[model samples]
Target: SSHHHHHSYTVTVATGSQEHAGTDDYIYLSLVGSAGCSEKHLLDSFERGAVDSYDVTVDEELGEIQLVRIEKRKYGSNDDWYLKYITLKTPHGDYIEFPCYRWITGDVEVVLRDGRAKLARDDQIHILKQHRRKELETRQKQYRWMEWNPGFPLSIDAKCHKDLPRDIQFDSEKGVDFVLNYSKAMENLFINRFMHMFQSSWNDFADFEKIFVKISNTISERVMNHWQEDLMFGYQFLNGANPVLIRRCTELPEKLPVTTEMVECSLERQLSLEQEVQQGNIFIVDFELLDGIDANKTDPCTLQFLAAPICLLYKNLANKIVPIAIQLNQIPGDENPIFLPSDAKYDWLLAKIWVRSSDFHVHQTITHLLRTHLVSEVFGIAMYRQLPAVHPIFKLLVAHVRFTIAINTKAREQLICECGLFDKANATGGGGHVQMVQRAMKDLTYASLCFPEAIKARGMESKEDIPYYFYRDDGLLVWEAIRTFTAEVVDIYYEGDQVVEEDPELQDFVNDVYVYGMRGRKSSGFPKSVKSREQLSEYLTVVIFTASAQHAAVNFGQYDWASWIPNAPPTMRAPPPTAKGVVTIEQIVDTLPDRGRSCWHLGAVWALSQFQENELFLGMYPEEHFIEKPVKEAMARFRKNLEAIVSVIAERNENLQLPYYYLSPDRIPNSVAI
Candidate 1:
């Protein structure tokens, strides 16, 4: 067997100004084709799954990964939201402000802390709001031969409230050739149209859509025309009308890179390049946000930076020197250990009363659950539109796990790596992204059900606002899934045995706890365990078939971790196992369950069930967790699938190369599909 080194650098901010000075950030993976790097050191968050880790056999360059390692990363499933503001302030007034900045970027990378102050930052390079035309200026001059990126159609400052276009470049007719000149707003408009397309998906053709598409087309035409010469402009017809020039609107422009010249000069200024993440090496971010307009000025300046952005939320504007995007998982980190408020204890305990008061033993052979919930919920256009499966164009990430003592630092690195992947997507069309997302969604959906209550335990509480996560197992059924899951997992990991539905070895432990779940709540001759058959009946059902498969997974065997009780005073402490789950989590996140599938599904199911229950009432969480056992079975299957891929790769080459470059997201010109 061959061995190689993988890393996950984690660090927490103590005091600002580089307390851990030795760390230096790096991105070894370079974009060569389809999914190329967006800039010097940024990336896409969805590049890991496009190219199978086991199949790609070339040695990835040093620092090929820009962010932290990911347990399982894929597109179409992650929720993406943009940062809309960074309003800086003081106890009494402002000390310079940068507001209404569109953090259209993804994943933050740089993190800094100084005593009481701290910041999380990510790139705003591709965010293209202020520098929409600026970023590609050098390239445009060389190829498109254009000057000035006429700003967005939307006006800035208080005036924008009028919902009118701003006067940009001098164009007498057509009200500021919106299509070509207004690149930033045009892109935003395109996204809006795209979302509208999906939103009115059933409408077939809304009169509003005809108007919207025309608006977008107008913008595209104006921008393209700007590049083309008109006889009226005192320009030559042959040169301007050349198909090459006219097509510039739709043609892929030559990428104007951030030259080595700027990089070298930046070094002279002594710019720092260092970060950390729990999952990736460097999470590159490409953002474009408009700072709040000069509140009083008619012509407010929009600043755009193509440099690496830091990606984290800050306590205050002064605290957000560099800001990056984050997940609920990211905020609930090692130093903090929990992400919920300190007040939910009472609500949680009170909520337990609603839980089946009787004990219920989980049965064997849990059924496999499906994700029909997301189809009904509206997906956000911000990131892949909550797709159960990604389009063929998007790529996933390249990740490997390594350990470092510092979490805040590690988190910075992870942000950088993820950003790097996004950068690749900016340049290339989607890599083999379709495959990974398809499966990730299935697994995430089926698996997340076991984690909802666990995550909610961390939600902000009304009593006190500090997250105090602990361990509690309230005999909640994971899902009615078991047989298929166990067999698959055992096959993958050991490749030698028939998995016991109720493992003979664990039977003793089972006997001890089975009674706890069966407390006087026997509906059938055999304790009222909600079987798959029973669950699918008149009501959406619950099953106790759930398991955690990934390493460092804190919520493996339980979900009803903690809750609050109005009678009990809420305090700041980890809950007991009987009262909580994974108290003070000391684990890693290897598998991510799809929230829509797990929580949202139940929410949706309940909504519908309550309608029926009350003459078309949808219960709170109907038709979900019908495969708690199936989840465990899926874990087993995931292990097997992983082993199979590993085995195939191992047989192909002794080097066991990890392909970080191949997984980058693809850039698209064919209707901007990627």
Candidate 2:
């Protein structure tokens, strides 16, 4: 099968089928083999969806083919090209396929390997090894990191969307699509005549319903109906926009000081509150993080109010979780009475509203923004800076980090900037949002970012421990699927622990995340360097999960649950009621956001919750970066696992009144684009 002879070869190249795939650029190619490298030749090819071939004859034997080098030089105004793949046929009629499903822009050269992907250790050839190193050297300069805020996660160095690298920024099509979706939402609300109420206050509960009179869906309609129910209030903790906070309560918090007599009437059973706690029927969601947060002042004449609520819940005999007691403030005192279901109607509802308000702060600042968007940006930036395109981890993660930088830049410019959306619409806006993020990061831990670890730490791992926790149930399935797929891919690249430790690029990647991303906090438990294949696999699992599933779980449900205004008021115009039975229906309405703020809050969430027209969901990789046989099979298996999860969740949601579809694989975008 082995021979040494000069031979003629035919090289065929195909352009991608995407719009603007063809380029008016000068293209050159060179073939490398075990024996020698061929002379560089200019190929007069590359038209959209077109294939062109060239014949060449070498002076001496080139031996077994190894790789090819392709260079693109700007020839005209249009210099971008998407080369799909290249095929070469030798004198012996042997065909080798080199996949290049990537965009080549500007003036650059790329070393194309055969369809098989390899790790650093697997590449024994000097030229291929240098190629991997050189690629990272170029990428590191292009993708640098910067601390956007002092205590926030490190993000891309770009100050704005325009400063971002061409590949990192949103394409023209995506930019137009996003703007259209955003404008359409606002247009719909404007058509409903809701814009006229912007400067007024909601006079009553009926005023809140006016939003849905013209535009509503099943979930929003159901939310409007049950938003005031205690049963539904507790159900939200298990299956709400922010399901990460609830924990199985074994004992009442000393700060809350809820007595048996205070909650016995609402337990719906003969058992005392202590007995329910002992039997694992009690749960708690404490908003102690908001203890001293500086609430926003909408204007010099008006100031908003924030509460650190401690809500106690019980799983009733009817298998429904209901709130038994709620303390709007963290400290126990006569002034901070524990409002019970037995309190006056409006008093109880106001207490729940305070809880939702506190949850709004936590959900928006911590769960959605800090945990998913910022943390994933850390990984995205570090990966770009340390790993090259050919690295297995990079190939696996590229799709999941798509548009993260672009979206975050947009947020900084329009959402979190001074006098931005948060400042106008949210209680924690102004400077409170920044402080909350800073405080939350101080308590951030690597374990908290991992789904299984976070659930186990909160004592909510078992299905029996916390029944009907669709977030945990569905999240665990997705976590395992990602971990399994990651391990399979990691094993292919890293043959052993030493191989993982010996990879300089991999080591630098983790170190970059540790230093810049985690701020070198040893207490965070973020690895300074990857030491084993399993460690790399777990780290990758956390990155992918945070970028996809975790983001989706906390996001995409804003309008469904929070659009009612009373359920999750973004800002409270009045202070929380300190004494029970004193609050009236009018007082509750006054505490909610004014119509102007409400309209802005509604617009913000409505704009954020939209799915991009070309959304890429979990397990859907259109780029095809990985080409090895085993890796391809592993990806197929990953897709199969995700498909099964989709079916399982669909079946379960069929029996649920308010379906928890946030964690559904099909609903989760592969990144935090929104």
Candidate 3:
């Protein structure tokens, strides 16, 4: 086991000489990201005053410092009413507007807050829009070489897209030199007769193809030509030529006549990387999207620093990586940059190439340790389009289970280490249920679900017309999930026997108090009782499985986590479970013949379930999920098969050396056929 150490850092706060009228006169600072910072007090809403320094903590392993936003909140308003510029504390003792005119020292990392913020003032809206505009301008030169158009026949002009004539490039003779004297009488007669017969009696010739092959053979032997030369001749040669002569060649097959070879070489390379995917060659490229793009040409940027590019390369065939679809991220263009195609197939192809290309720098290597392992083309380009099983949204349910076990174990140990849990005199001990609930609430499962409710409960409303927080009604499920799962594990470890599923006393108390509030219209089966882990199995089984897993899979957002209701990350969230044949939370709580008989506010549950029934529904179906039947059908089957693969892996009960290698999306085949 490894022990982790936290790094220490200091922070200082100073007031800026800026004030806005009508602001409640209180300015605040928020320290965001994994690198936790101290909450430093600064100038009041309209007041300018300095604050004392405070120490902050940063994770030594990931030394990441994101941002510290300065805001002005009114006395009672939830809105960050007073708008301010994104600023960076400078070394020269002054504040500079983020994306400020200075050259970028490095890829400045900024955390964009996602919570509700009321853009009540024009300054706020302008500041937001201006920041976005700056971000785009900064990225303009970053992925410049994405190559939406290959500059071939499509987006390129006819004059610019030119190729040399085959006769001049590959022929042994430059001009009429080869046939000058060889126009020998027999040659002239043969050519004239063949042309005349073909023009008038094209189909009438009994063995026209036979005669054509004879002429082609004679020309090939006498005149030298490149394997790929004379496309004009080859193109016309296919016009009614024996289909047998139109042989498909992978790059002008050796000794093959130039009559017509259906060139198909790109496919071979495409399949090269794709086949590796079949053999399990896939990689995961995790990305962190930060804000604050500054176009400081003089600083010279690297992916670590400078930003400059053009669309010259396509596939990093040897080493492949993938980016999310065109819905976000980079694009290609030189003079007139273009967004990636909206088409699902082609869009993912270019997006992968873009992602793969970004992470390499040809000049950086100082050691020669054979880094050229498997860096080439990508295989199963189709797989890149499917969502991986391990995506955060998809794994949130599974992750919660692990989190519950780990969190509860920590809480139990903390009580034991600090004081005796059974000690009645100790304020922190004896209240097992209350202690467990308090500790469990710290996880993301509770925080994310209850965030909006928490904010609203505080009576703070967004000043901006656009609502920011998206709330879910699954907090209680999380609450019970931890407690039940924790207790069940304890039962198993101690007794090593089958788990029990019911507890009459616990159920009676929950029904009488927790559900109907101790004073309901109906008589209770029973009321007060000591807590037991008897109903542990049932609680662990139902709450998390339906309320969290089934619920989130259907409604998690495709690109974002925030939504008014449930979200559908259909594009990235896999094994989408249907809401059909499922027991509603209310029905399970009340109608099901389980403990805690009284339905706890089924009306509220019913209303929430009905309103959020299609929480995952995008405005449109086909357009939202996938427009192509092939992609849709293939993805579903692929996802199903992948689920099977995962189960098989679990059956083996072994840990992996490279977990990401086996689990990354690109490695998983999207279809059984692959």
Candidate 4:
């Protein structure tokens, strides 16, 4: 009723309940009156609407049976492909969503040709055959359990053979001429899921009550007028309909909720399928409320704590849609009601994540429930002007950050378990303590919990995923650390009173190293299944020194100095673009490169040393190991290339309204999957 394609109806009537008019009831139809038409004429005319409702029943044993059931469950896998789906039924009323065979309602009998089925009917119910199964087998063979009801009625599509017409003659003994065809709902569901695999990219995620105005804005109101405001009231047509036996608002496709068991199954399967083990771990932002602040005005920087490859998972639309499952946004401190930033609500997570990582991190992420549409707008331009390519998906990183803090229990556990000094830690890090941080990283790394006896307040767990960590003050632990020289990495960062003792230059450079790596990855934005440490090193230098310098210069110190670096080689060869919702190769290839040779590439050297770190890198190593220079030299060149990149980022990011930040000009979260 709300759409031009067709009018719709709902099956509010319940079955096997006290509200039902009858038990074992059949929805019968009768033509009692007509407008300018006779019974004979109405049977042949396709345009006539149902004038009124009447009840009539037919004997199932008789060939002229008027009663046909459209069970909702039969729309799925259990039904044999070869059986004749003469009567479809939806006991759950969801089947009523299709206005009684809306799709395959045409008078044409030759809908299928010689048993080789085709989706020939526009909005017609198409039965799957041996041929189409070839493709379906590749993508849909596993999800065959969704269909079926308690009744033995096999849920299958009705078919009309070319030579042999279906029985549509008027019934005499069972007083009925036409039965409401439910094939339309079946057609839409089939096309929406299994059949629509061909349109895999049309994968817009859906949530309850979240409207998607697919048509353009030019006539948005006009379209809404016809779809909603007017008397034509079949709204379910656009959103989709329920079967005759089940209703929409009350029941889901199945009676099951997203139980923890189901979530584990769904997310595990999804994670395995969507994210490749080589793609690394997936991370969500944890938004924890700042103590005693109005949540509305204090947009807590939940997005501040993300690792690289893992963070990239939330950066953009997926390069691929693997079987994905995401834990819904679980906001913390809601009962006590922690206030947050002006924009976000503390009670709800909006449970929406868009990026499909290179691996199985995001399978089954979106559903009718859970998080719905993505936050499409980019925020905070002035701040990220000197940052990395972090746009089009900043919300994802923020969400992940928020999630990290909200889910700090395991993080705390891992820290406490490994440190053996839980008392001091639990006391110091009273809120979301350091032990929590260790446990959080531990999830990705699987390193054992252990406070290193060698380094005070330092913890070391050399697991394959997260190799090492350096503990900092309070609840923070610097993970993915490396110290081939045998010193605990934590001792350097959390040196107790040794912060001043450690050379300021070393501290600055070390911190700069991480920033650089993070920025480079942000700059690239594109992810692949495999990456090398060389790329990692380059990205770090680019983000930390270059982007950091730009931020410092533009926001505080220098006025005109900027940075630039050559485009780092990508892991996978670039490919042609197809998905509309992804960051393009053009975006990555065009990051920050100044054609002229005069642009500064090193910030520290440019300011104090007056030497380009790259000057030492031109031919010091072979062509292969150029970006692979020693730590200090690499740090030095990283500063130069990063500085060069900053010049480009500063100018380009100044005028954008949507994409605010570039990934760190020199940051690259380049690492193996962990």
Candidate 5:
């Protein structure tokens, strides 16, 4: 006993730099090593951006530290702490780092491994193996999956934002910011002033412009000025708020039987319909999914209508895309006449408005909510439940899934719930939203989630085939940037297929996603297990892109394109006209959303499109998750690539009247926060 020697250890703790990162409570730290565990030491010096070191003498040598367990005890007014990291310097003059860029509160204990990210197969120690299993076991309990609606993607178990786990719920500051932004939009837009006009109808188009009197942006003003132009209507398909619907039309669909005489006057270069189709100049946006979907009947006296229109755009000799033909309904019948630009002015305008209304439904239900918000939730919940903190994939995806569950919970509670915003304002809100999301999810495919693959699937990949597709062009650039970064990160841990196949934790994560997220549907094409590095990289890229760039593309522009209410009406009060040339200006006004609904719709978009004060944009990683030199270098390269893309987009927007700035990396948040 006298000959035995004690080892001296130095422990340093660093608090995060974020607001409210410091805690006014007591913190207990414990070091777990292969040979023995150190006694818990109480440290009372965790101030924001503060680094404090403490020395401890262990009775015996604690060989090869494996984990660090930190627990926070409530003692003062503030209990939450954002831990930046901890470093332990052992008696052998070697340092071990445990990275934990996460929040801790309420007597919770967080166990962190060494900063080195690892795969399941790389773990050799029994304690490390048990740690991974135990972490997932606990996570599974906290984050369970539940079906919000039949056939819809599985979401978090929580019913509302309050039901969410404390860690995932919005913090007080964020909650304040959200409320302030919404209230500011309401005040700035003078929505309260328009409340008196809500129960009434708009007498003319000029009435819509009155709402923009107090406040207006460049894009919204532009939308108001050119809302009726055929060229601008077609341009929205390619660059407006929802740009994913348009696709190159090689041949006309049987449902839309448009005769050559109907659109001959609108076609340019004296070309026939067949010639335009063959020349790869014809495009189409079909809303067949809304064909039989129910429209909102929240207000019985004021009925809402939904259209399943098929709009055809021709790339004229001037190289400008214009809607030449529009069928109000999917079925080609005498009752559903094809409305063309050559038709009466009001008829053509009304047809375009109906198409815009349909776009609103699809955009809200499928494009924005289902694809970005819900799909990301599936990935986020699966990642949290199956992957441990040290897992490479977990570190890679943690930033992208930040606040996703919280945001979705809020959406379900306040936005999409019965009598909520969607139910009150949107045509699809009351019940059509539920059915539309379910129908869209049934057709969800793995390829469709991937940006490049989706572009190729729609035959809009080639520049020569469909030029001026800003969504596709900018989307591909961002996709490749993410892919490159993901590939590098995936390569660092996975040496070959064996490493990927042998990782049980990784396998479990994908299987969970396949089962709960996709309902174990083979038709979805989502892999139940990842067998190769390429597959893992591609999947990671898709998740990251959907959470960030894809969401930005569909969101952010809502106020710009939809604030001009007629450009993108959330609901229609009147049904589609049975006969062409019978529509009048008064009828067109009646067909659009009523005053109250329009103001509500504008408020919704204005609030949703706001950029949060503390937005964590694409390529910006505040938390240092990846500690490896090569991985850090890869992140830098990703940021550089995004900057170059920003320059390219800026140069392109300068030459255009309506710029497509949604996909710019700097503006895209790392997750679907709003």
Candidate 6:
């Protein structure tokens, strides 16, 4: 004992198994430790059993030890032992067990170093964790969802690296930079890369959409940075590009000369809210503003085609048509000062579009379609530029255009206010006012999808029918969206009990008896419950083509009321008439004046062409058709005005080929008139 003590207490241990670790079926461990060295017979063969007593001594100087239990399950090809519980007996006769927990694989080695047990594994495949498992399941299941379906107008910002090697990871930013330098064009590699990802789906759309908004902000920032570096005319105008112009007549927020930093932090962040919608529908060009380009003065021949709204059409695998390219016509406050030459130049932009549209159509890269019809034929020729301010077509367009601009400007300005409905609520949650931006984009996208069907609902054919019918339908659709938005906002705030009567803005909007006709109500016309959503929808349809973008400017032509009507606000009234203190749709219809009723007739035919299903518009007509004799007389006068405007257009424009249905006066989609 004295000699052993002089050798110093050491625990030397080795494991022996009959089978090798790799490609073996079973692993049985025969462990002989320092205890075996202490007692020669005790170390022989193996002792594998649960003991109630200290049957073996682990060390000579310390306590007696006994094997309690050995446990294991198959791993890879073999199992040694896991969760070993050994009991130690002290001098007091109290016994305690120490357990070791591990994956008892032959491939794993456990060694005692500095009085601590260390385990190491050599080259093994890892089983999946919760997140990894779900990730794999999602990838495998939804791999072909968007690829094969493609019903929605798909878009994406950040998507996973494709065909990447697992061992080596490349920095995304660095890779993008490399490809961009190699391409040496404004065309970004990420754009095509992301387009492919956008075209693909995961799980159902909800899961894909979740992934989209989460990662799209980074993608948006990256895309903006790329655009700023290569196509930096100034990113301020990027928001101006939309499927339907939200801020039609007014300028967007104050300009900042648009730095890359501003675009990345501001517009890109906002654009990422409904990431795919804006990306799919809008196309941006950082062009200089052309100042003082009057719609009234631009010559027809030179046309100086400042810009023309063009559609880059595509059909997805679901056979659903996606219509893109609704950059607004110069909304009022938004009209820019100088035209940027490079991309904004009409010729340059149109030329590129010409090549791409044909490529897209020919290869059916995006869709199959007719082409070589020429951009001018599809777009420019239908515009006011083709016929001047004096032409019946131009008169028909300018008025509606101006009116739509006014309404859009007002709504845009109102909704985008920091203190307005959405932005204020969401401001603290890392989103400032961009939710409004997304709302506008999404709502407008819905309207765009409905457009072709609306046109086809009637008997119209040919792109040539565009000028005659385009603005009326477009203006009405935009107006409906605006009203829908307004109704929803009111519904939400009121429903949440958020609207304060003391809040003057709400007060003003509510009490606008002349416009909204909400005089008698407590919160003006704000809906009290969800039950009113449908009623509110029907209530607002009157103003659709009547006074706002949808109604008055497009189809109805002018206000049905007198400028000096008995109880209307001054702002809602007509200017003192040289025409007098009275301006009526009747007055404009009385004579198709250049300023007032120019577009009245053209818009009427456009409105009429829809062959409005009477049942669809059952609730839209005047609530009390027989309420008063005065109302009846007024209705007759309005009808006569419509007839007069129609006759004027039909009589004139010998050069213009009016749609055959327009001359015959086909059914309007939701017209009050028969």
In candidate 5 the C-alpha lDDT for residue 274 amounts to: 87
TM-score of each: 0.16, 0.92, 0.17, 0.17, 0.95, 0.20
| Model 1 spans with C-alpha error above 4 angstroms | 1-310, 315-447, 454-463, 466-674
Which model scores highest in lDDT?
5
Better of 1 and 4 by lDDT: 4
Strongest candidate by TM-score: 5
**Tens digit per residue, CA lDDT, model 6, 1-674:** 01111112122212222122112223222223324323321211112221222134334543232222222334453433322223243444653433332224444332211111111111022211222234334323322111101221111111332322110112121322212232232122122233212112223323323422332333233332332222211111111111122111111222312222322222322443134223342223211121122111111221111222222221222322222222222331233221112233332232222222112111110110001011111111122212221111222222222212221222223322233221211111122123222222222221222333333432222233222333333333344443443354334333433233333322322233212222133422233322344443333332233322222122221111101111001010111112112333343221111211111211222222223222222112221212223333433543454444445444543443212112212112232221
Candidate 4 lDDT, 1-674, residue by residue in tens: 11121121221211111111112212222211111211211100011121221122222212221222222222222221111212212222222111121112122111111111112121132222332233233212211111111211111111211111112111111111001111232232222232222111211222101222321122222333342211111111111111000011211112112222322332333444224223443222222111121111111211111101111111113221111122221222222221111113211111111111111111101110001101000111111221111111111122111111111122222222234222110111122222222222212110111112212211112223221111111001111111111122122222343332332322322232223311213332322210333332222222222122212212211111111111111011122122223443243332211111111111211232122222221112111111112333433543455455445545544662211121223321211000
Stretch of 10 with least lDDT, candidate 1: 357-366
**Model 6: residues with Cα > 4 Å off, grouped in runs:** 1-347, 350-612, 615-627, 652-654, 657-674
What C-alpha lDDT, on a 0 to 100 scale, does residue 563 get in candidate 3? 10
The lDDT of model 1 is 0.19
Clashes of each: 171, 0, 31, 122, 0, 32
Residues 1-674, model 1: lDDT tens digits: 21222221111111111111111122112212122222332222212112111111223222222221111122343332222111112222322112111112123222111111100111243322222233223222221111111210111112111221111111122222222222343343333333222112112223323433343232223322331111111111101110000000111112212222322322222322221222111122111111110111111121111111112211111211111221111222243221111223432222221111100000000011111111111011101111101110011000000010111122122211233211111111021111222222323322234333323332211112111111111111111122233333233322222222222212221221122212222331222222222221111111212211111111111111111110111111111122223332121000111111122111211121111111101111111111134333454453354344334334433441211111000100001000
Better of 1 and 3 by lDDT: 3
lDDT (Cα, tens digit) per residue for candidate 5, span 1-674: 01111237788888866667778888888888999888887755566778877776677777999999998878857568888888888989988889887779765589999988987777888889888778888899989999988898899999888777766777654562433555466766887666435457887887777777555789988888888999899998888889888888989889888877878887776778988898888889999999889988888778888999999988887777889999988878999988888788988898899999899889988999999999999999999999999988898999999889998888787678777766656888678888888788777888899888898877778887567889889999999999999999989889898888888888989998899999999999999899999999998999999999999999999999998888898988888999976889988887777777777777778989988788999988877777888888999999999999999999999998778999989999999889
Which segments of model 3 are wrong by more than 4 Å?
1-40, 43-514, 517-530, 550-645, 648-674
- Cα lDDT listed for each candidate: 0.19, 0.82, 0.24, 0.20, 0.85, 0.24
User: In angstroms, how far off is 72's CA in candidate 1?
Assistant: 51
Residue-level lDDT for 316 in candidate 3: 26
So what's the TM-score on candidate 5? Answer: 0.95
